[PDB]
Amino acid sequence: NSNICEVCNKWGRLFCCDTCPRSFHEHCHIPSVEANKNPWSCIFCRIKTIQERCPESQSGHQESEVLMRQMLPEEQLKCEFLLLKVYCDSKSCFFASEPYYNREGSQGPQKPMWLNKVKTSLNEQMYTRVEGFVQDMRLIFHNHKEFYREDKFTRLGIQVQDIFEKNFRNIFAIQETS
């Protein structure tokens, strides 16, 4: 097993996957690492199994169809994984916790959003469709773009949104386009 957390790349109190060499801090894994269960399989392994059980799940999909899916167990898992993929980028630190807004010449967003709030929402099963989760994710970056205007700090929102969107297309097998 790896000697660092797959998500935050630090050592500490780690839980090891039994089916692959990844390791996790308790609350870096999503969902939080389960109390018992021997053997234990991580989210990367659980996502791989879905694909292996239904190879055709990797054929291309339209985003509009994906968004309307109900949050059944397999779509819940895919959203948890997509969330985890964003936390895997160190630039996710800027979007993790509750923001505040007091900048000359800007007003804060009408509906603030941050990664830990989406994490809790997923944990508490507050999304009924994929669209709910993806809307809150995109809102994080859109709020940041609007607030920071022409400050070059806006680019952090662009950068982390690109990680989100690449992973969204991969995890949900969105049809490749030009």
Ligand SMILES: [Zn+2]
């Ligand atoms: Zn970690």
Ligand SMILES: [Zn+2]
């Ligand atoms: Zn694993």
Ligand SMILES: [Zn+2]
């Ligand atoms: Zn099948």
